[PDB]
């Protein structure tokens, strides 16, 4: 109870892009995750570290929600402890990461007949990023050895590019909204529990 703000992140009209995901903090309220677990709107829900029925009994101090939108094939790919193309440049999962992702299809919610979309993600980067790190700089990446004096074009390729989703696209290209819930425990009294 206590008016837990779970109706502001999971179900909202607009979500931020994957490269700049929306970060929210939940604490100081008691919630019942049984209703959320028994929902058919979620495409998949499975992870480690806690049982679905044990969520109410265990008490956690902080909850961090990271909401974004990814492709259909990227939902299965993202997982802790594995190296991937999208996981090495935009979102990295720690080995001891507590929590997991929830993905749902929103093709009807977000679809256009044709054109470029406002969502951006990076294809090239200098190196791997630290886990749970957000990058906002959109500077060009010097792919070629020879410098171009910072001029857009060859050997100074722009990393960010759009999705281009289509309603007629395959199941792997469907727009999937993903929210990552992470449970954080610190040297503070627990604030989130169950009834």
């Amino acid at each position, epitope marked *: 109870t206590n008016l837990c703000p779970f109706g502001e992140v999971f179900n909202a009209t607009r979500f931020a892009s994957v490269y700049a995901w929306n970060r929210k903090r939940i604490s100081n309220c008691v919630a019942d995750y049984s209703v959320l677990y028994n929902s058919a709107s979620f495409s998949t829900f499975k992870c480690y570290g806690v049982s679905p029925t044990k969520l109410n009994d265990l008490c956690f101090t902080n909850v961090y929600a990271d909401s974004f939108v990814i492709r259909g094939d990227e939902v299965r790919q993202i997982a802790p402890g594995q190296t991937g193309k999208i996981a090495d440049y935009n979102y990295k999962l720690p080995d001891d990461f507590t929590g997991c992702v929830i993905a749902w299809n929103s093709n009807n919610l977000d679809s256009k*007949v*044709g*054109g*470029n*979309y*406002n969502y*951006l993600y990076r*294809l*090239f980067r200098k190196s791997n990023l630290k886990p749970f790190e957000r990058d906002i700089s*959109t500077e060009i990446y010097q792919a070629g050895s020879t410098p171009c004096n910072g001029v*857009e*074009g*060859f050997n100074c*390729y*722009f*990393p*960010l*590019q*759009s*999705y*281009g989703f*289509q309603p*007629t696209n395959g199941v792997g290209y469907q727009p999937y909204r993903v929210v990552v819930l992470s449970f954080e425990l610190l040297h503070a009294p627990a604030t989130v529990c169950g009834p």
Partner: nanobody
Amino acid sequence: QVQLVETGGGFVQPGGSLRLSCAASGVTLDYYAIGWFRQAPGKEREGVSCIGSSDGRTYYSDSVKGRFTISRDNAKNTVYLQMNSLKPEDTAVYYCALTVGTYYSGNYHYTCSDDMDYWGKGTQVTVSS
């Protein structure tokens, strides 16, 4: 159901003129970047040129030497490339591929990289003395 076809294969002594035509069918994207990639047996893959369909700006390497002329027929949705001054190192199979554009802060930028979504059956060009 995007389909790509490449035509214009020809064999002739160095110093002639060559023409390549890329035709795309079933394209559901209003704006896209169309690029030519050449590959030869025994050497890796590298891009030579690619153009955007928003107004027609082009991105090219240092080996163009100004001899590559690229035109975009919007009515037929065709890419026509003409070149002269045949170079022995340019003999390879050419593939034309289109990728989705990039929108950022009201500006149009095209990402023209190695990774590609679609592919088509390119054409072989071999020139030797």
